Amino acid sequence: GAKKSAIGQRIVATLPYIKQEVPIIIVFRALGFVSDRDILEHIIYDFEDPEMMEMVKPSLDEAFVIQEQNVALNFIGSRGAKPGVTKEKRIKYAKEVLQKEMLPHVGVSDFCETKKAYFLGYMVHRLLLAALGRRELDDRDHYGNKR
């Protein structure tokens, strides 16, 4: 169809303990970043890369609706293991998941958002590099990727 054909590729994230997929800009906004300039500072490190900017543009076109942390958290928490009958409990569940089950190795304290955002941006950046054919895809049989 026409709209999918024009959009092309979109970037989505599968957070644990959540019913289905979430667009990445929603998660970044839920972390507390509103401005597209700031989100692109977290993702695209060198802004003199028009191909990367064009690749990330359709992901930002899903931010036409969501613009605030509260509504972003609501959207994330709507899809919990047991969806709530209220809204404050759903938003608290969303914050709890983004603070406890998303990237535990970065941190679990209250002020870990400033680093979780950077690491999630690094994941997205490496995905873009893979999609542009600038780094080789990993292989599971390589023994440096084993324990």
Binding site: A2, K3, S5, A6
Partner: protein, 592 residues
């Protein structure tokens, strides 16, 4: 050395990197050995379950447990597999002149007669006229058999499998009766002709006297009778073998005995025999061959792993590379992305003052002699791909007009300038998002040329006697010709067959479902047999044709393709107890 070419022999020893590379090489062999076994066993089990109850009845027909005919004569001839031998026909390949000289029995020279036949027989031959008429009629029958053979066996293969080894029987007769080849014989060629005619009546496969039964017997013994007449020709007997009366009588007796012994015994379990005979090679077994190919052919899927479609050309396209490349272009799918160089969306409301300076002259010429939207869709076409496919910008423009109608505008440059330019303008619903959908559709849906679903098409001269065209010259020999043959990826058989300058007779694919839906059930049977023969004989192995024919008939007996799975096994109108023992027990029993 870097990528693993071991320069040393096992006696000199391997340097450490070569040792590790050799271990990496041997691991693959160990893995294949440990992997193929279960799949081979499963294939053999499925075949056995499919054909476990097919038998040879006392009617001589081949029927399953429900008395449904599979073959009216086992192996289409009625003989047993373990009693037949390889033999040569010896009258198919020789030219006209050689054939006549070798099989004519000249009775006019009379010096060859005095040298080969006895004195009391040469006078009889030169005096009688009924003898001469019979001897000419024999050669007429041999010529007709030669034409029948050439129809049955194109590509000129003499090697064949028949029950009685006539040449070895003749050698045995010569040694048993102490025949001296340097002396004239006492065998009357009329006795030879009459003996062969009487012998052929005692080799009965289909018993009866109705026209239907006589036709069935003639069809059942045609090839062997042709071979018998070719071998026991009177001239060949007089020149080469030089038999005698008692020797010829003993030979006829031995032929009768061996033919009667080489007939299939009623009660044989030919279905299980065929299952084992086709499944035991599986344990030793750019396309797919071997175990995966056998799996695909047995359980037919509508999506083969590597579909292909070998295409033969009719005329001068077969020889000259020009029309060969032209057909190659005609039969390969190509959208606009395959030829486009770059594209862009501009904002240029001024027809005269154009943001791009290159189009100025011709865009002004177009606009000077006549609303519209101010947006643009400027695309650039790669010259190399544009000129490779022999495409033309007028052709692209008319294809765009056909695809979108006159609600678009199109202005195009020509190949004179170094930059080939196409400019498109439109003659909720905002322009930029509409132009991006126009570009996206026009680049992935245009279909400028080719046949859809045909991805890549190759073009190479054949190097095998089955993929080459073999004709018969005016002197009767077989001459092999090399003509260009195509080999595509992806299958759409009907369109390729309907294409101009494509041979509608020899064109074939390797998708069984496609062959079915295009050509029927008999064609699917023949094609399935050919594919099975190819996969089996890729390894140089040999399997008797009767087992192949039985498997193909079992699979295509009921008019539709019957995959050997639970679906096909339970589709049969058999008893529930046969189906319960195969891939579905409780469900079948409870349904019944």
């Amino acid at each position: 050395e870097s990528r693993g070419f071991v320069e040393n022999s096992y006696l000199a020893g391997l340097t450490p990197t070569e040792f590790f590379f050799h271990a990496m090489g041997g691991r693959e062999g160990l893995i294949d050995t440990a992997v193929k076994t279960a799949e081979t066993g499963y294939i053999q089990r499925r075949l056995i379950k499919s054909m476990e109850s097919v038998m040879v009845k006392y009617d001589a027909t081949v029927r399953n447990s429900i008395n449904q005919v599979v073959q009216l004569r086992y192996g289409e001839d009625g003989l047993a597999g373990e009693s037949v031998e390889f033999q040569n026909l010896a009258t198919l390949k020789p030219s006209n002149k050689a054939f006549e000289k070798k099989f004519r029995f000249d009775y006019t020279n009379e010096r060859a007669l005095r040298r080969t036949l006895q004195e009391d027989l040469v006078k009889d031959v030169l005096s009688n006229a009924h003898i001469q008429n019979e001897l000419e009629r024999e050669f007429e029958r041999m010529r007709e058999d030669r034409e029948v053979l050439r129809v049955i066996f194109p590509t000129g293969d003499s090697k064949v499998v028949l029950p009685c080894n006539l040449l070895r029987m003749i050698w045995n007769a010569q040694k048993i009766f102490h025949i001296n080849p340097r002396l004239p014989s006492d065998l009357h060629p009329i006795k030879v002709v009459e003996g062969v005619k009487e012998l052929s009546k005692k080799l009965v496969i289909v018993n009866g006297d109705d026209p239907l039964s006589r036709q069935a017997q003639e069809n059942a013994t045609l090839l062997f009778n042709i071979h018998l007449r070719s071998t026991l020709c009177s001239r060949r007997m007089a020149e080469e073998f030089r038999l005698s009366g008692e020797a010829f009588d003993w030979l006829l007796g031995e032929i009768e005995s061996k033919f009667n012994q080489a007939i299939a015994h009623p009660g044989e379990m030919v279905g299980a025999l065929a299952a084992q005979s086709l499944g035991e090679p599986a344990t030793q077994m750019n396309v797919t061959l071997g175990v995966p190919r056998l799996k695909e052919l047995i359980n037919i899927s509508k999506k083969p792993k590597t579909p292909s479609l070998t295409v033969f050309l009719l005329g001068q396209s077969a020889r000259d590379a020009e029309r060969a490349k032209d057909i190659l272009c005609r039969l390969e799918h190509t959208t606009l992305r395959k030829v486009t160089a770059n594209t862009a969306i501009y904002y240029d409301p001024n027809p005269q003052s154009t943001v791009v300076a290159e189009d100025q002259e011709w865009v002004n010429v177009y606009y000077e002699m006549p609303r519209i939207s101010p947006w643009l869709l400027r695309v650039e076409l790669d010259r190399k791909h544009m000129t490779d496919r022999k495409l033309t910008m007028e052709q692209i423009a008319e294809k765009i007009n056909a695809g979108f109608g006159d609600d678009l505008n199109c202005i195009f440059n020509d190949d004179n300038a170094e930059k080939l330019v196409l400019r498109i303008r439109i003659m909720k619903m905002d322009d930029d998002v509409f132009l991006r959908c126009i570009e996206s559709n026009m680049l992935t849906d245009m279909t400028l040329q080719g046949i859809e679903q045909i991805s890549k098409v190759y073009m190479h001269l054949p190097q095998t006697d089955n993929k080459k065209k073999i004709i018969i010259t005016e002197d009767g020999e077989f001459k092999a010709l090399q003509e260009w043959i195509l080999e595509t990826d992806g299958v759409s058989l009907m369109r390729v067959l309907s294409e101009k300058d494509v041979d509608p007779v020899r064109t074939t694919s390797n998708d069984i479902v496609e062959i079915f839906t295009v050509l029927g059930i008999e064609a699917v049977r023949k094609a399935l047999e050919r594919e099975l023969y190819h996969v089996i004989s890729f390894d140089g192995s040999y399997v008797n044709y009767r087992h192949l024919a039985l498997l193909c008939d079992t699979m295509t007996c009921r008019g539709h393709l019957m995959a050997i799975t639970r679906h096909g096994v339970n589709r049969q109108d058999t008893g529930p107890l046969m189906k319960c023992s195969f891939e579905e027990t409780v469900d079948v029993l409870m349904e019944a």
